[PDB]
Amino acid sequence: EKTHVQLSLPVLQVRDVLVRGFGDSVEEVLSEARQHLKDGTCGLVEVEKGVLPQLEQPYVFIKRSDARTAPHGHVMVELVAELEGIQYGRSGETLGVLVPHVGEIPVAYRKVLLRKN
């Protein structure tokens, strides 16, 4: 409905993640990421050296879409997928890579304002 939704995403350590991606195609991983975001079952892994090789492609990133500011502490973000070096969507700085959340203990929470498709 609303164009944006406030979410608090659990930040997960890459080596804890049990399900290392959302599926097998760009369209499936964006769809599954959106449904897990809706269901409150989406985690966030912050991207550092060595993180992406330990996750499964296609990747779904949340990237900063923002205008001038970030409402409250919630950065405005949108989804961008990546498969074999090609990205689908264009957006700003990467806040991290999304993965299914199945009970892993987070190290932090990231407050974001997720934009619609």
Alpha carbon distances (Å) from 84 to 22, 37, 53, 59:
16, 24, 12, 9
Q: Which two tokens stand for residue 29?
A: 């991983």
Q: Which two tokens stand for residue 53?
A: 């090789």
Q: Which domain holds residue 4?
A: 1-117
Residue 111: Cβ-neighbour burial (10 angstroms; 0-12, 13-18, 19+): middle
Q: How far apart are CA 82 and CA 89, in angstroms?
A: 9
Alpha carbon distances (Å) from 61 to 9, 36, 77:
13, 14, 10
Experimental determination approach used: X-ray
Q: What is the 3-state secondary structure (H, E, C) of the chain?
A: CCCEEEEEEEECCHHHCCCCCCCCCHHHHHHHHHHHHHHCCEEEECCCCCCHHHCCCCEEEEEECCCCCCCCCCEEEEEEEEECCEEECCCCCEEEEEEECCCCCCCEEEEEEEECC
User: In the chain, how many domains are there?
Assistant: 1
Evaluate whether 20 touches 54 at the Cβ level (below 8 Å): yes
Tokens 């974001």 — which residue? Answer: 112
Tokens 């975001």 — which residue? Answer: 37
Q: How many CB atoms neighbour CB 49 within 10 A?
A: 6
Resolution in A: 1.8
Evaluate whether 82 touches 57 at the Cβ level (below 8 Å): yes
